[PDB]
Amino acid sequence: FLDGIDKAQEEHEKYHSNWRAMASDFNL
Amino acid sequence: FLDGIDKAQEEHEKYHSNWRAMASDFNLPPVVAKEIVASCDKCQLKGEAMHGQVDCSPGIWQLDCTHLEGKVILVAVHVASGYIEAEVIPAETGQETAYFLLKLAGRWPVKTVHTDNGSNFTSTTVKAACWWAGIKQEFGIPYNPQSQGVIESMNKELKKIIGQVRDQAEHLKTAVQMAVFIHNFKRKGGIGGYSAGERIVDIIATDIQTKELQKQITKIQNFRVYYRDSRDPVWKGPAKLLWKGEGAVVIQDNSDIKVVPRRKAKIIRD
Amino acid sequence: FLDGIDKAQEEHEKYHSNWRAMASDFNLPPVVAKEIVASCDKCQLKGEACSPGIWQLDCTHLEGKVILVAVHVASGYIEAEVIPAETGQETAYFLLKLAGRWPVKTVHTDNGSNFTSTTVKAACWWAGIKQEFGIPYNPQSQGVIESMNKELKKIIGQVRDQAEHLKTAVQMAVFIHNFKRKGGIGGYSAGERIVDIIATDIQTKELQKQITKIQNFRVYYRDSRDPVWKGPAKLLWKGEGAVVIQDNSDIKVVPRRKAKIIRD
Amino acid sequence: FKRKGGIGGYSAGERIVDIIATDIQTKELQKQITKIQNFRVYYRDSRDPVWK
DNA sequence: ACTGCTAGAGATTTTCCCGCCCACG
DNA sequence: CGTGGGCGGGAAAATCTCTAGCA
DNA sequence: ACTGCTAGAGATTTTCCCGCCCACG
DNA sequence: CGTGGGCGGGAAAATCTCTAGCA
Numbered sequence: 001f002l003d004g005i006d007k008a009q010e011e012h013e014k015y016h017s018n019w020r021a022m023a024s025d026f027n028l
Numbered sequence: 029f030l031d032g033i034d035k036a037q038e039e040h041e042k043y044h045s046n047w048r049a050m051a052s053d054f055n056l057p058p059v060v061a062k063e064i065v066a067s068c069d070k071c072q073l074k075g076e077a078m079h080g081q082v083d084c085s086p087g088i089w090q091l092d093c094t095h096l097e098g099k100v101i102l103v104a105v106h107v108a109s110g111y112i113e114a115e116v117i118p119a120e121t122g123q124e125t126a127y128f129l130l131k132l133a134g135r136w137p138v139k140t141v142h143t144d145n146g147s148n149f150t151s152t153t154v155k156a157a158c159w160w161a162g163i164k165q166e167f168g169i170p171y172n173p174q175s176q177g178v179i180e181s182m183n184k185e186l187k188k189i190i191g192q193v194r195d196q197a198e199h200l201k202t203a204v205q206m207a208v209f210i211h212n213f214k215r216k217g218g219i220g221g222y223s224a225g226e227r228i229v230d231i232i233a234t235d236i237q238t239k240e241l242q243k244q245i246t247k248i249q250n251f252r253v254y255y256r257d258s259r260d261p262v263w264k265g266p267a268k269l270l271w272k273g274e275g276a277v278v279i280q281d282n283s284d285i286k287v288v289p290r291r292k293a294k295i296i297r298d
Numbered sequence: 299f300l301d302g303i304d305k306a307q308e309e310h311e312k313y314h315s316n317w318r319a320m321a322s323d324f325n326l327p328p329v330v331a332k333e334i335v336a337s338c339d340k341c342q343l344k345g346e347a348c349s350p351g352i353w354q355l356d357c358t359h360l361e362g363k364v365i366l367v368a369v370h371v372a373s374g375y376i377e378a379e380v381i382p383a384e385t386g387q388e389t390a391y392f393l394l395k396l397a398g399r400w401p402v403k404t405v406h407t408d409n410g411s412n413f414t415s416t417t418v419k420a421a422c423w424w425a426g427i428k429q430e431f432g433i434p435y436n437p438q439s440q441g442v443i444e445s446m447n448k449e450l451k452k453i454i455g456q457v458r459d460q461a462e463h464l465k466t467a468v469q470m471a472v473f474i475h476n477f478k479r480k481g482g483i484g485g486y487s488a489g490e491r492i493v494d495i496i497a498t499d500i501q502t503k504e505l506q507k508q509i510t511k512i513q514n515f516r517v518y519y520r521d522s523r524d525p526v527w528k529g530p531a532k533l534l535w536k537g538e539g540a541v542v543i544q545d546n547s548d549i550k551v552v553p554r555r556k557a558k559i560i561r562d
Numbered sequence: 563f564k565r566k567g568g569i570g571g572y573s574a575g576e577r578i579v580d581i582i583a584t585d586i587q588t589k590e591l592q593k594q595i596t597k598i599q600n601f602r603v604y605y606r607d608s609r610d611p612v613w614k
Numbered sequence: 615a616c617t618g619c620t621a622g623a624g625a626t627t628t629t630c631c632c633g634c635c636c637a638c639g
Numbered sequence: 640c641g642t643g644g645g646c647g648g649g650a651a652a653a654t655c656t657c658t659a660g661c662a
Numbered sequence: 663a664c665t666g667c668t669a670g671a672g673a674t675t676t677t678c679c680c681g682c683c684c685a686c687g
Numbered sequence: 688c689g690t691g692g693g694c695g696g697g698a699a700a701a702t703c704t705c706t707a708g709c710a
């Protein structure tokens with residue numbers, strides 16, 4: 001794959017986000 | 029007095045023995061053994077074992093200075109939500125911390141500060157600024173950094189994310205701003221999966237909703253509760269009804285928040 | 299509960315109130331209120347283009363010293379910062395500070411030389427902020443920005459004897475404009491409006507993030523006195539005894555034993 | 563405005579204001595405040611830092 | 615292929631004893 | 640007039656926990 | 663009059679789902 | 688030949704616990 005997963009990967013590249021933040025913000 | 033008890037005392041004078049040793053060697057009750065243990069002024073133990081409670085009120089903010097790469101960093105943290113804020117200080121002095129506190133008071137509803145007993149946090153400029161802004165000052169135990177440890181844990185977290193974020197930026201403080209942005213917004217979890225930036229909204233939203241609803245309801249609902257207390261027949265009152273229960277109401281007579289049963293109660297309209 | 303939906307529908311036909319009024323008044327789940335406000339014809343206004351990220355930027359030069367002023371224009375909140383030297387790095391630093399405190403989504407400014415640096419472009423690329431140059435979002439508050447700057451200069455003319463340095467009096471002035479200026483509909487100084495706007499935006503974007511995964515899902519359902527598995531209807535509220543769905547245009551309730559939820 | 567009598571000594575336009583004020587107080591506002599002040603409170607007790 | 619551990623203090627639960635008194639022989 | 644049993648009040652014993660110190 | 667506290671990792675318990683197959687309409 | 692319900696196997700979610708570090 002989804003585009004939200006790829007944008008969560010960009011979020012991980014910029015901020016090293018939590019797993020729950022990426023799961024909540026993109027329904028993962 | 030038995031002679032073995034006096035010789036137990038002399039044994040404690042020579043060796044500072046256990047209470048169980050004097051109990052077993054002379055067939056003694058443990059009360060007199062712990063008395064003889066308490067008798068010696070050198071037989072003093074390691075203290076008591078329980079932790080205190082740090083206050084959790086929305087008007088309190090913790091503040092502390094820390095050190096990294098030869099620079100001083102001023103951190104302030106709201107206690108209930110964990111919303112953080114940090115800056116690099118030019119020099120450790122009370123006037124720049126007073127300027128930081130004035131920025132904090134201008135941006136947030138701050139009522140009471142609580143720091144340690146450092147030199148910069150005891151300046152006359154900080155006292156004059158807190159008198160100008162009407163901020164109650166408070167300090168902790170002079171040699172106990174544990175009451176203020178909640179901001180130290182966040183300093184640890186801040187430097188840990190600073191370790192993750194130092195390579196992206198040239199200067200230190202740019203990465204510091206990026207890190208405080210990351211922790212205030214990007215880091216989720218805690219109580220209900222939110223960042224601290226949402227809880228600091230929700231706490232003040234409940235603050236400027238619930239007590240205003242309470243002020244609107246306290247002028248309308250005014251019930252006078254007379255109560256027959258336990259072990260007695262005296263109908264005492266009147267008390268202010270806080271909330272009507274199903275089998276037990278809650279009231280306040282003068283200062284006692286009491287859960288008095290409704291069968292032992294009597295509610296008057298005015 | 300379920301019989302108030304039609305009297306919310308005729309209410310939205312006569313008066314066209316939003317989902318919050320029909321949700322809080324009729325004690326409904328807000329998803330059926332958002333679908334009632336969604337199914338209307340003349341209640342379909344514009345999109346986002348409201349915004350909590352309405353932020354005006356304006357520079358001034360007072361006492362030969364630069365003051366950069368930001369305004370949260372959705373709530374009328376305003377603050378500023380004393381800047382020593384006019385460069386894009388200072389504006390990017392202040393913009394990253396504003397992004398760290400509040401969720402800055404869009405900024406409105408002019409085409410000034412200090413605000414057009416590539417450092418600010420890299421900062422807003424790392425932040426993800428829509429940017430406007432010279433374009434007002436709406437021309438009502440356009441003069442009000444300048445009038446608030448003049449109001450803050452009047453507050454500076456009040457409190458210049460309250461502090462020695464420029465920025466200390468500036469912080470006292472923004473404290474006064476945050477708290478010592480009352481009025482309005484319910485006596486809000488400056489912060490209660492912006493925390494109300496931010497709380498409502500957070501709640502409605504949580505509702506958007508909740509509902510954006512439900513519309514992918516399918517509910518195949520049969521009825522009571524029926525074995526014909528109809529669908530796939532759209533889920534509104536998953537319940538323990540009754541599940542709310544919509545098949546074509548009707549808000550229906552179903553037993554969970556008659557339900558079948560596709561996970562994608 | 564200027565013909566005052568009755569119980570409380572008001573005129574007509576003031577008595578109707580006080581009467582409909584008491585009416586809108588006792589009509590729905592008490593029930594509205596008592597049905598909105600139910601909330602969610604997290605807390606901890608003494609000698610234990612685990613919030614409940 | 616190696617590894618955190620141990621003495622003491624309230625605190626709290628679990629359990630005999632005694633006296634006693636109310637219920638019975 | 641001569642016993643029994645539970646209770647309750649108190650002592651006292653086993654365990655929970657928990658803490659600070661070893662640099 | 664003051665007060666230890668907080669983010670993360672296995673681990674363990676609690677709980678939907680699905681498919682299926684054995685028991686039944 | 689046409690359905691229902693428990694089971695089991697697996698996912699997955701809420702909580703227990705426990706530690707590292709703040710000089």
Ligand SMILES: C[C@@H]1CCO[C@H]2Cn3cc(C(=O)NCc4ccc(F)cc4F)c(=O)c(O)c3C(=O)N12
Nearest residue numbers: 617618619620658659660661662705706707708710
């Ligand atoms: C010169 C050798 C060479 C190898 O390294 C050093 C350093 N060291 C450090 C501690 C120490 O930190 N004790 C306090 C402590 C803290 C935590 C914990 F879990 C256990 C603890 F004992 C010692 O006791 C010790 O003997 C030594 C030592 O001998 N040496």
Ligand SMILES: C[C@@H]1CCO[C@H]2Cn3cc(C(=O)NCc4ccc(F)cc4F)c(=O)c(O)c3C(=O)N12
Nearest residue numbers: 092093144145146170171173174176177180709710
């Ligand atoms: C110069 C002021 C004057 C007063 O005394 C000093 C010394 N100090 C020491 C620590 C420290 O050891 N933190 C680690 C830690 C260890 C155990 C625990 F339970 C809690 C903890 F935070 C600080 O954090 C700190 O800020 C200070 C400080 O500021 N000062």
Ligand SMILES: [Mg+2]
Nearest residue numbers: 092093094144
């Ligand atoms: Mg300190």
Ligand SMILES: [Mg+2]
Nearest residue numbers: 092093094180
């Ligand atoms: Mg410290």
